[PDB]
Amino acid sequence: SGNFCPLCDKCYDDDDYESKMMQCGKCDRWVHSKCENLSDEMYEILSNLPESVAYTCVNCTERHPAEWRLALEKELQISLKQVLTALLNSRTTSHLLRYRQQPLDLEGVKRKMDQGNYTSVLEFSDDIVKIIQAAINSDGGQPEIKKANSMVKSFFIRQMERVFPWFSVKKSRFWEP
């Protein structure tokens, strides 16, 4: 009865846990992820925020923008930077820093990121996969360009698995056999 999303006004079942909904930390009601205009990636990131960051429904939101929104936006950018920073500061990625938007090197991903061009985890991952994959395709008969390539790759996949557990770098369309 009282089980209806305030935004779309439609009913929801107390038992369908396959639904993508958030619970307001104030009144405990549920709201559809899609009704707050959130992509599945956003929903996953939210399901990852600290227990300290509660989702809050519109009417329970006192000051706008709702804090969960700014926190969400910051979380994605900070997490992306967290990963890139590690890639940049590694001794195994030195050869992918500079080529010698579709960035052909890490310094390029770096600029594309600082300018706020990444709005999803998928685009960021794909740009990096392409760079790593390009290096793998051209590291003919040579290690540390073959060896390093695989440890920046393993490094990338693992680093991403840590920050974005719900995301699959392995499935990227840009990997080659």
């Binding site: 958030m22 549920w30 929903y43 399901s47 960051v53 509660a54």
Partner: peptide
């Protein structure tokens, strides 16, 4: 943030 997933 609590979700159906968490």
């Amino acid at each position: 943030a609590r979700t159906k997933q968490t």
